[PDB]
Amino acid sequence: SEEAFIYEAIRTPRGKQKNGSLHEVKPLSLVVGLIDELRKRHPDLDENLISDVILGCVSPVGDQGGDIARAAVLASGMPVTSGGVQLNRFCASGLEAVNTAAQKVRSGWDDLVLAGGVESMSRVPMGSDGGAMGLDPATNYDVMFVPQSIGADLIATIEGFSREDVDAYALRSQQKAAEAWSGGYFAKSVVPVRDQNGLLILDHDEHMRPDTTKEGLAKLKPAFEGLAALGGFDDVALQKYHWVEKINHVHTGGNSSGIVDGAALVMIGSAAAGKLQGLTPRARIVATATSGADPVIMLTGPTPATRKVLDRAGLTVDDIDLFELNEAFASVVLKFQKDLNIPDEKLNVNGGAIAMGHPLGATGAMILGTMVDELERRNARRALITLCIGGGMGVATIIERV
């Protein structure tokens, strides 16, 4: 019954995959830079009261292996009692870390925890860690593994989302992200990345394409790179979804999330912990929920996770002011909106990963922090944050402005 509160939520800008500004930055440095910013905001914070640092990371190998969270605690000069643990629940890892931190606070056994994520996809590409679901034939065969982009195309086929429908949502994402940046919505929480000399490396989400046109999006070709370009995956998906004759391939590089680098950090604590440290709570974690759906279509987890977290908090869709769902693919957002009858003006109001990028292990903590700021900016009450997850999982979180 110990309420968990969000005291700080920040993130780096997202650097692009090709000729990106963050490619020269070690992912450890991305996390340490955000720790330095938190220390810069609360210099008199007794860091000995921080009992853990929980980082989501989807490819914890190489530069991101060996418990990068503990490396960040030690490299940043945080106390040796401050813990450090890495977790991987795929694209939801950043939000899972936040939820796990909030549940540790509610248990009464941890008082002040840092949570977030980090992902340098330009240095540690997706799939660098391997895995049995994809690489073990017995497991792959039995689970009917299908790349996520084909699940996204199957959703658009089943729900009747045309190529123009998903390209219309992508255009709105570019526009909303540009308006948020030009409006100053992100000025307080996007921390510029600098080198050891204080020289600027990156201060903006360089994956954005604010001049995107509906005509330009229509000229892009369907996704033909990676595992999706390989054979048999359409047949596998239709063997489970046997009432669908043919998959309409509507998703491209322009209506899917970008490959980017970035990190995010959130400070979570109890009321007594914040009062002892002169911290002002920005939001309260109302409820979390973990659920899932079919792993073949993979990307329909957000709906059952959202229903579960709403029932847990005793709320309905109408009680939520802002819905934030990661934009891995345009059809996933349109499906989620159709499932729950979500108004457009509540959904991803500041743009999403189609415009700004999807740094796997960090995204969940980025869009969580984005909703903390936007609730405070609008003086609104409740936000629901959720992400689609590989293997069909779903995670949802409700926060309430304080």
Site string for a copy of itself, 62-81 (x = CB under 8 A): xx-xxxx-xx-xxx---xxx
Q: Measuring CA to CA, which residue among 207, 248, 151, 226 is closest to residue 353? A: 207
Q: Residue 123 binds which one of a copy of itself, another protein, none, with CB within 5 to 8 A depending on kind?
A: another protein
- Known catalytic membership, residue 57: no
Cα separation of 135 and 123, whole Å? 21
> Would you count residue 3 as binding a copy of itself (CB under 8 A)?
no
- Known catalytic membership, residue 388: yes
Total binding residues toward a copy of itself, as defined by CB under 8 A: 68
> Would you count residue 145 as binding another protein (CB under 8 A)?
yes
The token duo for 110 is: 């941890």
| Contact between residue 289 and residue 377 where contact means Cβ atoms under 8 Å apart | no
Residues 59-78 that bind another protein (CB under 8 A): 62-63
Cα separation of 396 and 289, whole Å? 5
> Would you count residue 375 as binding a copy of itself (CB under 8 A)?
no
Of positions 190, 236, 287, 354, contacts a copy of itself by CB under 8 A? 287
- 204-216 CB burial, b ≥16 within 10 A, e <16: ebbbbbeebeeee
> Would you count residue 108 as binding a copy of itself (CB under 8 A)?
yes
> Would you count residue 37 as binding a copy of itself (CB under 8 A)?
no
Q: Measuring CA to CA, which residue among 88, 155, 127, 89 is closest to residue 225? A: 127
Candidate ranges 42-50, 241-249, 253-261, 391-399; the one touching another protein (CB under 8 A):
241-249
- Known catalytic membership, residue 249: no
> Would you count residue 235 as binding another protein (CB under 8 A)?
yes
Q: In angstroms, what is the minimal distance from the CB of 367 to a copy of itself?
A: 19
Cα separation of 206 and 10, whole Å? 17
Which C-beta is closer to a copy of itself: that of 17 or that of 88? 88
Q: In angstroms, what is the minimal distance from the CB of 18 to another protein?
A: 12
Backbone angles phi, psi at 124, to 5 degrees: -120, 90
Which C-beta is closer to a copy of itself: that of 34 or that of 250? 34
Q: Measuring CA to CA, which residue among 220, 267, 219 is closest to residue 102? A: 267
Q: Where are the beta strands (DSSP E) in 143-206?
A: 193-194, 200-202
Which C-beta is closer to another protein: that of 171 or that of 223? 223
- Alpha carbon distances (Å) from 292 to 68, 100, 298, 306: 28, 18, 9, 10
Catalytic residue from among 57, 91, 207, 249: 91
Q: Measuring CA to CA, which residue among 54, 120, 103 is closest to residue 83? A: 54
User: Is the CA virtual torsion 332, 334, 339, 344 positive or negative?
Assistant: positive
Q: Residue 86 binds which one of another protein, a copy of itself, none, with CB within 5 to 8 A depending on kind?
A: a copy of itself
Which value, to the nearest 10 degrees, does the dihedral of the CA atoms of residues 395, 331, 228, 59 take? -30
Amino acid type, 129: D
> Would you count residue 106 as binding another protein (CB under 8 A)?
no
CA–centroid distance for 235 within its chain: 30
Residues 198-217 that bind another protein (CB under 8 A): 198-199
Of positions 10, 31, 50, 146, contacts another protein by CB under 8 A? 146
Q: Residue 33 binds which one of a copy of itself, another protein, none, with CB within 5 to 8 A depending on kind?
A: none
> Would you count residue 134 as binding a copy of itself (CB under 8 A)?
yes
Q: In angstroms, what is the minimal distance from the CB of 39 to a copy of itself?
A: 17
CA–centroid distance for 36 within its chain: 22
Cα separation of 50 and 299, whole Å? 35
> Would you count residue 109 as binding a copy of itself (CB under 8 A)?
yes
Which C-beta is closer to another protein: that of 109 or that of 243? 243
Of positions 40, 44, 184, 232, contacts another protein by CB under 8 A? 232
Cα separation of 378 and 373, whole Å? 9
State the DSSP H helix or E strand holding residue 217, giving kind and residue range, or none if neither: helix 214-218
The DSSP call for residue 320 is -
Which C-beta is closer to a copy of itself: that of 58 or that of 342? 58
Strand, coil or helix: what is 118? strand
Which residues bind to a copy of itself, rule: CB under 8 A? 1, 26, 28, 51-52, 60-63, 65-68, 70-71, 73-75, 79-90, 96, 99-100, 102-104, 106-110, 127, 129-136, 139, 142-143, 287-295, 304, 312, 390-393
- Catalytic amino acids? 91, 358, 388
- Point out which residues bind another protein (CB under 8 A): 23-24, 26, 62-63, 123, 127, 130, 134-138, 140-141, 144-147, 195-199, 227, 230-233, 235-236, 238-239, 242-246
